Ligand SMILES: Cc1cn([C@H]2C[C@H](O)[C@@H](COP(=O)(O)O)O2)c(=O)[nH]c1=O
């Protein structure tokens with residue numbers, strides 16, 4: 001009679017139900033339903049996957065989920081068709097697969113609808129032409145879960161034996177920790193170096209103040225390394241005659257950033273709002289499931305024609321023609337953007353204050369990215385003083401452009417304003433001011449700028465950045481203090497062990513290559529079991545070698561021997 005539609009959560013069921021007619025009956029599975037718990041039955045059972053019997057698995061219904069299973073089956077018989085409207089990512093394809101497996105029935109009974117936002121039009125087109133479940137994406141998702149399970153359950157026991165009980169190892173988690181350990185060690189080994197700068201405050205012919213910075217001496221960059229050198233330079237500069245060597249006036253511009261993707265969202269939310277990766281991703285999700293923003297797991301800065309056309313109309317009505325570019329800006333699935341540009345952060349219904357703030361950030365970035373650039377009149381004055389050359393920078397805002405959508409400025413607005421001076425003009429020295437500085441050590445990773453580092457290295461993945469970040473934290477390898485990452489001693493002890501006995505597993509390129517391999521499975525360019533066999537072959541040669549006595553090249557035990 002009617003159609004059954006399955007989503008993964010109550011919040012999502014409610015939202016999507018506003019856009020589905022009486023023919024459809026929405027029901028949230030309210031969870032994952034089914035999942036995982038030279039052989040050794042012992043291991044296979046705990047893992048729920050069997051590397052020695054072509055990877056057959058044993059999925060089991062979750063606790064208290066039996067009522068849900070049975071509640072779906074009967075609803076399935078009273079429906080003519082079944083639509084799996086899980087989220088568009090691989091994990092979402094696997095969950096759909098599990099629902100289809102559990103409920104059973106002809107495959108023709110099922111359809112897999114895809115949408116990256118829950119709006120009337122997005123839902124309409126999603127159920128207009130519903131595609132089929134994609135087994136390749138499912139295999140790509142399970143291949144990941146399998147190798148993750150293998151490393152965790154087969155490396156961890158070795159760590160208990162060799163280092164300490166309760167420790168964990170993670171295919172990617174251990175690589176993420178490595179980045180933190182290397183960073184921790186760069187910092188511990190840094191030797192701050194001394195270097196000086198010299199500023200000069202002068203007077204234009206009119207008498208207006210002009211501040212300068214010494215740049216060259218004898219046509220060579222100026223950078224003394226001690227107090228004596230600066231003084232010698234200072235004595236020459238006190239007697240020198242100053243004059244404007246050259247004035248270069250040129251117009252500059254600044255462009256709006258591209259619309260957000262998972263990683264950039266996390267960084268900006270962390271840098272501007274002080275939100276950790278977990279917080280940002282939990283609010284993003286609720287915004288998404290409430291129908292306010294597009295899917296929050298993406299690495300595409302692409303924007304649909306309608307989205308661009310709706311925002312351009314908003315820019316045009318609320319800001320004006322000079323803020324609208326000739327043609328739309330194209331940045332090279334969709335970015336994270338509001339679903340309706342006319343819905344303001346302040347109009348959100350059941351969203352807490354911070355969730356509204358995240359929406360605001362997303363909204364502003366989206367509107368800004370389709371606006372014209374800001375224009376500035378930049379000025380660069382070069383000054384000569386004996387064998388010295390000095391500099392003064394400054395710019396004037398000519399047209400705010402995209403920055404009009406961002407809060408009003410209030411600080412060093414018009415970063416420095418230079419007075420009226422022409423080439424050949426004479427400046428009067430009023431005061432010299434030398435200053436001592438010291439090179440700083442590399443910044444400590446932040447939850448977000450680590451995702452950034454993970455992204456740059458092709459190690460992360462929109463759907464895993466969050467988990468990775470939190471999954472390496474309560475295991476005693478690294479900790480977040482003052483919003484920063486600190487490597488624990490145990491994080492170093494384990495990292496060296498792994499690098500020594502599991503080189504390939506800890507290598508950055510190989511870890512990145514595995515993501516490619518996973519994309520290949522998803523795109524029918526590689527078969528999942530063969531990819532897992534190869535992975536396992538490489539893994540077990542590493543493992544057996546590590547298992548041996550250290551005098552055979554096995555893993556070093558965490559000990560300190562007697563006299
Ligand atoms: C300049 C810079 C900032 N950040 C960050 C992380 C935080 O989001 C923010 C600083 O916040 P914090 O002072 O609370 O640590 O800027 C980096 O991660 N790397 C950098 O190089």
Ligand SMILES: Cc1cn([C@H]2C[C@H](OP(=O)(O)O)[C@@H](CO)O2)c(=O)[nH]c1=O
Pocket residue numbers: 088089090091092137144297298461462463464519522
């Ligand atoms: C869930 C998931 C998605 N993705 C990527 C690949 C997916 O495209 P394909 O699965 O390549 O369509 C896309 C789903 O949003 O994001 C990953 O790389 N890893 C994951 O674990």
